[PDB]
Amino acid sequence: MYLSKVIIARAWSRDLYQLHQGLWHLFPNRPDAARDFLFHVEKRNTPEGCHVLLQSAQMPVSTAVATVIKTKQVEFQLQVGVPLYFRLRANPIKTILDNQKRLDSKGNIKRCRVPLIKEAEQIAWLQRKLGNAARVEDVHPISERPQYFSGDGKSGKIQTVCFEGVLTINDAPALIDLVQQGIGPAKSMGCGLLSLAPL
Amino acid sequence: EIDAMALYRAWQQLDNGSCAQIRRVSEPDELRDIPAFYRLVQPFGWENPRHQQALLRMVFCLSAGKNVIRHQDKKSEQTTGISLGRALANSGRINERRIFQLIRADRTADMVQLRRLLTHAEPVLDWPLMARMLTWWGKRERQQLLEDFVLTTNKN
Amino acid sequence: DEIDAMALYRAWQQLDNGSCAQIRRVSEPDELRDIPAFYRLVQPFGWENPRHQQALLRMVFCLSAGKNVIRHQDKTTGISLGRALANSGRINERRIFQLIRADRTADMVQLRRLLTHAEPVLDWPLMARMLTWWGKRERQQLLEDFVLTTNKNA
Amino acid sequence: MSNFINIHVLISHSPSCLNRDDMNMQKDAIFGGKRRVRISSQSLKRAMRKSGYYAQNIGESSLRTIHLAQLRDVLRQKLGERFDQKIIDKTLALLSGKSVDEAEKISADAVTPWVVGEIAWFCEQVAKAEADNLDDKKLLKVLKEDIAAIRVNLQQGVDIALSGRMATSGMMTELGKVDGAMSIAHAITTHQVDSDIDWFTAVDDLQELGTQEFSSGVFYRYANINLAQLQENLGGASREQALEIATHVVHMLATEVPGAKQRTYAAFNPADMVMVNFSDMPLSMANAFEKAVKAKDGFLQPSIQAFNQYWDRVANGYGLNGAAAQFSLSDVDPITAQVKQMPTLEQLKSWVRNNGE
Amino acid sequence: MSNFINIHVLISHSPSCLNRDDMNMQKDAIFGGKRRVRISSQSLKRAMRKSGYYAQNIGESSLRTIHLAQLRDVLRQKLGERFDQKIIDKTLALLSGKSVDEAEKISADAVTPWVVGEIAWFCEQVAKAEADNLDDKKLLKVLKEDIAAIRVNLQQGVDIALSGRMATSGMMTELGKVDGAMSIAHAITTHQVDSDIDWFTAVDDLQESAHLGTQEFSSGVFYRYANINLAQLQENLGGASREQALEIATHVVHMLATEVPGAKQRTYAAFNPADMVMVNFSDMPLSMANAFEKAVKAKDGFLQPSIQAFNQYWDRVANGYGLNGAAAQFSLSDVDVKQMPTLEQLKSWVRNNGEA
């Protein structure tokens, strides 16, 4: 597992799709299939590009558009019952089936993921996702701008929520699994990266 | 091969979300980044590049607000519709030196200034005229804008 | 049939130092289009009729040399620009060769620089008509007048 | 030191759903080089106007609107038993000022704060038209000589007397021009709110200072009431009354939160911190938090301490004369100054009611 | 070192908008290649003139207008019991070079600061002009001798003695020309500022959507600079004593240290006091603006490193160009020049010409 800080040129950073496709070229294997990586956008505006915190299973190699600043080999050593700081940009949703009777490819009724617009439901979603791995001691749900994107031929939305707070570890391997694999949908759109720190 | 007034109408009928996405933009080049723009402007000119710049300008002006630019048809006695210059002059909130600076601006900058004027003016004008001037936006069009403003104030 | 009056000249004489300062500070007639005081000055005559616009640009541009650069003198026919520049004695005929060979905006520039250096006396309506057309025969006639007067006063 | 009353409030509560943009994110502001959660002045003010405490202790809130068409129905409804409808139409149309033609759609430049009282008063005065009739311009001339009588009517619409209004296309442009009397600042956190954590470095410290609170936030609210200007705005009125209203304002600023949800420490005490200070010139203690208040135990205690120290330095440094009273109750930390300590918020309010006696 | 007294003020402001332009944008200025929030010197000066402290300690503020039709009525009311009205009428026309004919609207060339005292004085002189009666040219030729006698009256309007006035028409063009004596800079922030945008709405109580508006606002550590030429101030007041001038100087220090423009203070209320005030005497004026040419960066706020940078640059300039003049500094934060614990002691230190 490798943790890095990467910057992407503005000309290759208009949509989250462009961020994904641009970050992709740091690991040349086809088809891996991958992503074996997660990332979190901290600064969105140029120059030089957009700053990103990239967790991966390989060592990134800088390209023309994607520039690595620092790289780290890291082993998460988590102890039980220890208070920690956490940050997680996530996509809290509810899969429901459409009030409009739109049709998918199979001729059945289409489903839609909808944002949870109430704090209680978001926090409930969070502690639910964590489960027996950890218990949320304190949480700040930061409301973000709705993100839009393009490609391949579809224009869609990703409403994100940025959780920042304190938690306590109950089970370490489960939490390591949560960090490594990611939490929630839109993992390719810069969600699911759980960042931890000591207080 | 010409852009219709329908765009304006479309801009009027579009939902608040996309309008919010479009309104908060600094430069016309930054307008390219957002998808709602492509969805709005798709019927009229893409992918024929001849209109693209113009469209970028037009929508940008429209990006001032949903009801900033108030459209008024030309009277049968008027023969020609109220022009952008005449509009900004009639508003009474605009000082001529900023239109001077508008005529002295270059590329993206001018649009930046122009939008800023519209929001402060809440002008009434014939939209096809403004669209026509924005399509080319040559030196003569700028100078004509200034003509209309200064002449309108001096004559009335 | 629409003619630009001599009133313009008078107006130029009576205009304030501020606007005249704004006007004199100009390189080309298009930059004269750029400034508002010009539009305020030239409206009555007027600017809103495109048949007159070029002529007005030239006339005002020439007057922009200064408030008392072009000195109007009543007349059979009044002193012409060629005769004026010749009578001044400060102008070299080569620069007028240049003037006749110049193209578009350049010639007007060259013309203005001459006036400032000449301080000529002439009948303003004549210069106004010549600036109204400014064809090949106006150029040619200008050079003719200059050369003939200079030859006649040497 | 008097005529200006300063209200300093430290109130801790949720930093999440208070005041937002049009793009679904909490309002913020940069102070001391760090980003802080913000609640706009208008948000606090409206939160006060439509509060229950306002309705019980101050009176009816003003009705701010732009639709005169919807307005005429309400006016005729509530005060039709008192006056004639055509008359109401006349005084309305004059007062705004566009003709009311039953067109069911009249919008005029607004939003403008309308109180039913003054409108009824103009209904009383327009009776002079039933006299001669006197020319409206003349009536304007007469009414302009005595605007204070109009100002007396704003006792039923205090919020206008506090925040003020402006007119542009109405006769009231000369009659309803009200400024003051309360100046209110935007509420900003005394501390940085987003975690200042270099996670990239943090992963190294995983094997192994003050704790940070996330669901709570210490906001600093400032307010200032010009007592004389309030007296003028309410029509010639007793100082004591202006201080009473001032106390109500102190309480509201001390307790109220947008969305009407309570403080994080609301269950124990009525307020987290409130200091009131009489002065000749307005003074804000925002610069007590220019240096970002880092977490010690919580954010409240060090915020209070910082406030205390800055108040010491400002008080001694410039002028330490004015009447002041503090409600902290925080653990064992003193303001080395000439300030009266109050055990309860009600004692503080009472202390203000008596002009700092 | 004397004659020039330099006033330096570091004052931090909470989120506000103390100065706008014609398009409601926050006034700014590029310094050191980076954007700074700017407060106009004219704005500070007016904020001083119309302040209560000015009324209490200095007195009458000059009234500036072009409307001579209104000024006619005003002068007629304030000087009616003292002089004949035809005399006032003639005097105003002599000073302005305009009308007298009871017109509904008499407008002048530009906004000129008027003081009732000077006009009263000129009425007292034109009373003597009624004797012969000497022509206006002869009277003006007579008044050409004693300019200082006209300047003595200017103590009823100090704002003119501080900021000066320019006369274009009338007899003021040869008598009312006042220079000096206070040079004040535009207040700029010591650091780079990216202005925040307040997205507000106007809630219609009679309806459930809405269109939004924007208001530019920002917080920041401003550096105000002022400078008083004592000799010029004495000349503007008719050769007044130095001791009398230094008091006005102290009042200027206090006002520059405490006064804040009332722009958007009803909605933002940036009523903050100055965190630092330094005063130094010098034979040559000197601004410490280049202390912040290299825009300060926030360590624990902008205030602390602003103070530090200011002190450092002052040391550099002082050692570099000699500068052995009286200097005193007053700060709220006690941290690393003579130190003054309070502002009153600083003002008293100025009153005694920087000595002790």
Side-chain angles (χ1 to χ4, degrees), chain D residues 39-59 61-69 71-76 78-81 83-85 87-97 99-104 106-123 125-127 129 131 134 136 139-170 172-176 178-195 197-204 206:
Chain D
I39 309 176
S40 68
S41 63
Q42 52 272 15
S43 177
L44 297 177
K45 287 193 283 188
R46 187 189 175 78
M48 291 165 138
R49 303 193 314 265
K50 310 282 172 170
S51 178
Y53 179 89
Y54 186 99
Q56 182 180 356
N57 293 92
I58 309 185
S61 307
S62 184
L63 186 140
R64 291 175 197 274
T65 185
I66 184 160
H67 309 326
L68 306 172
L71 185 63
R72 72 185 194 253
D73 295 88
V74 181
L75 293 181
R76 290 161 180 210
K78 186 184 184 304
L79 287 181
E81 299 286 346
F83 300 100
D84 288 309
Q85 289 184 337
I87 295 302
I88 297 176
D89 289 22
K90 181 81 173 188
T91 175
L92 199 65
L94 180 63
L95 266 190
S96 51
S99 171
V100 182
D101 311 328
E102 198 73 12
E104 310 156 30
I106 318 289
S107 59
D109 291 25
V111 303
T112 312
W114 304 96
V115 304
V116 301
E118 65 184 6
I119 305 176
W121 194 81
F122 284 105
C123 290
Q125 307 303 115
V126 68
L134 188 56
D136 303 340
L139 179 62
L140 272 177
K141 178 61 170 55
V142 178
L143 291 179
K144 281 212 296 294
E145 280 290 321
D146 184 28
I147 69 168
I150 302 184
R151 298 295 170 260
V152 180
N153 212 314
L154 296 173
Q155 299 202 11
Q156 302 145 116
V158 178
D159 63 293
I160 291 174
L162 285 177
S163 300
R165 69 177 161 187
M166 59 169 290
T168 62
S169 183
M172 210 160 62
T173 191
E174 289 229 84
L175 284 66
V178 190
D179 49 12
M182 182 181 64
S183 305
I184 176 169
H186 289 210
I188 55 178
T189 61
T190 61
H191 59 97
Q192 176 186 350
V193 191
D194 52 338
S195 309
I197 302 171
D198 195 319
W199 312 92
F200 185 81
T201 74
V203 301
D204 294 324
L206 189 58

Side-chain angles (χ1 to χ4, degrees), chain A residues 88-122:
Chain A
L88 174 58
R89 171 162 297 120
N91 184 20
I93 51 92
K94 187 175 299 180
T95 64
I96 56 112
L97 55 93
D98 201 336
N99 53 14
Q100 318 168 250
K101 288 189 209 180
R102 278 178 294 181
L103 298 153
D104 67 330
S105 175
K106 287 176 184 175
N108 301 333
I109 277 198
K110 171 188 151 59
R111 289 180 303 275
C112 302
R113 289 170 187 160
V114 295
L116 305 180
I117 69 176
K118 302 178 197 180
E119 302 192 38
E121 294 182 340
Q122 294 175 357

Side-chain angles (χ1 to χ4, degrees), chain C residues 12 15-28 32 35 60-69 112 116:
Chain C
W12 171 254
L15 189 57
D16 65 323
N17 305 324
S19 300
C20 285
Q22 300 185 7
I23 296 177
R24 292 192 302 267
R25 194 193 188 277
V26 76
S27 49
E28 295 184 354
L32 198 62
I35 64 173
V60 177
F61 187 84
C62 287
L63 291 174
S64 79
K67 295 188 180 185
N68 207 29
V69 167
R112 184 160 73 91
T116 65

Side-chain angles (χ1 to χ4, degrees), chain D residues 289-330 333-339 341-355:
Chain D
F289 320 109
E290 196 268 340
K291 181 182 183 299
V293 176
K294 299 303 176 182
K296 181 212 308 175
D297 183 39
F299 277 120
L300 186 52
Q301 295 293 151
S303 295
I304 301 192
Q305 204 183 352
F307 183 99
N308 300 156
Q309 299 189 326
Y310 187 72
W311 173 262
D312 294 329
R313 299 183 174 282
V314 172
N316 284 279
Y318 283 78
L320 48 87
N321 185 29
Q326 190 194 232
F327 181 76
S328 59
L329 196 59
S330 57
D333 296 329
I335 43 172
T336 169
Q338 308 147 353
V339 182
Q341 294 292 136
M342 317 304 292
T344 76
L345 183 65
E346 302 294 335
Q347 288 193 31
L348 176 52
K349 288 198 265 158
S350 183
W351 177 91
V352 177
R353 290 191 212 266
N354 298 328
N355 199 77

Side-chain angles (χ1 to χ4, degrees), chain D residues 19-22 27-34 38 40-42 45-46 49-50 62-67 71 74 111 163 179-186 188 222 224 226 281-287 290-292 294 310 313-314 316-319, chain E residues 11-15 53 194 196-206 212 217-221 254 257-260 264-277 298 300-305 330-334 341-344:
Chain D
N19 196 28
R20 291 181 177 182
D21 291 328
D22 53 328
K27 288 205 179 187
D28 55 338
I30 298 188
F31 191 28
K34 297 205 170 287
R38 179 176 55 91
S40 68
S41 63
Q42 52 272 15
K45 287 193 283 188
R46 187 189 175 78
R49 303 193 314 265
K50 310 282 172 170
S62 184
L63 186 140
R64 291 175 197 274
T65 185
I66 184 160
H67 309 326
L71 185 63
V74 181
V111 303
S163 300
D179 49 12
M182 182 181 64
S183 305
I184 176 169
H186 289 210
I188 55 178
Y222 170 81
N224 169 73
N226 190 341
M281 184 163 192
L283 290 167
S284 172
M285 299 289 106
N287 292 297
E290 196 268 340
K291 181 182 183 299
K294 299 303 176 182
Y310 187 72
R313 299 183 174 282
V314 172
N316 284 279
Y318 283 78
Chain E
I11 170 181
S12 177
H13 283 299
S14 54
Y53 180 87
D194 296 329
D196 293 317
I197 303 176
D198 183 37
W199 300 79
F200 57 87
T201 63
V203 188
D204 185 6
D205 282 336
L206 294 175
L212 285 84
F217 73 96
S218 69
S219 59
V221 181
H254 189 181
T258 56
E259 285 302 320
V260 176
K264 305 296 292 183
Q265 296 290 75
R266 295 291 130 83
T267 46
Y268 284 84
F271 299 99
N272 309 98
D275 294 88
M276 188 193 64
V277 174
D300 277 325
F302 286 118
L303 183 57
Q304 187 171 152
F330 158 69
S331 298
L332 264 48
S333 58
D334 285 78
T342 69
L343 177 61
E344 315 300 319

Side-chain angles (χ1 to χ4, degrees), chain D residues 236-300:
Chain D
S238 59
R239 181 175 179 85
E240 186 177 1
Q241 176 178 1
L243 277 95
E244 183 176 358
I245 302 181
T247 58
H248 291 343
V249 174
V250 173
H251 189 177
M252 288 189 295
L253 196 75
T255 59
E256 288 298 323
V257 172
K261 60 180 179 181
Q262 275 55 56
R263 314 184 287 96
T264 177
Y265 277 56
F268 295 96
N269 44 341
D272 291 326
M273 178 175 179
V274 184
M275 191 186 68
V276 181
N277 160 245
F278 286 78
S279 286
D280 300 330
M281 184 163 192
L283 290 167
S284 172
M285 299 289 106
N287 292 297
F289 320 109
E290 196 268 340
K291 181 182 183 299
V293 176
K294 299 303 176 182
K296 181 212 308 175
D297 183 39
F299 277 120
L300 186 52

Side-chain angles (χ1 to χ4, degrees), chain E residues 155-168 170 172-173 175-176 178-206 210-215:
Chain E
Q155 304 198 55
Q156 308 293 297
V158 181
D159 51 30
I160 295 168
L162 291 176
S163 69
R165 68 175 171 187
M166 160 187 172
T168 60
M172 278 294 194
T173 183
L175 297 174
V178 183
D179 185 32
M182 180 187 64
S183 307
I184 180 175
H186 289 215
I188 56 180
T189 57
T190 62
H191 54 92
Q192 176 183 12
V193 182
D194 296 329
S195 297
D196 293 317
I197 303 176
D198 183 37
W199 300 79
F200 57 87
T201 63
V203 188
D204 185 6
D205 282 336
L206 294 175
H211 184 271
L212 285 84
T214 63
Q215 176 55 240

Side-chain angles (χ1 to χ4, degrees), chain A residues 174-187:
Chain A
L175 192 45
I176 299 182
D177 183 84
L178 286 183
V179 173
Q180 175 178 339
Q181 303 297 332
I183 298 173
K187 294 175 179 175

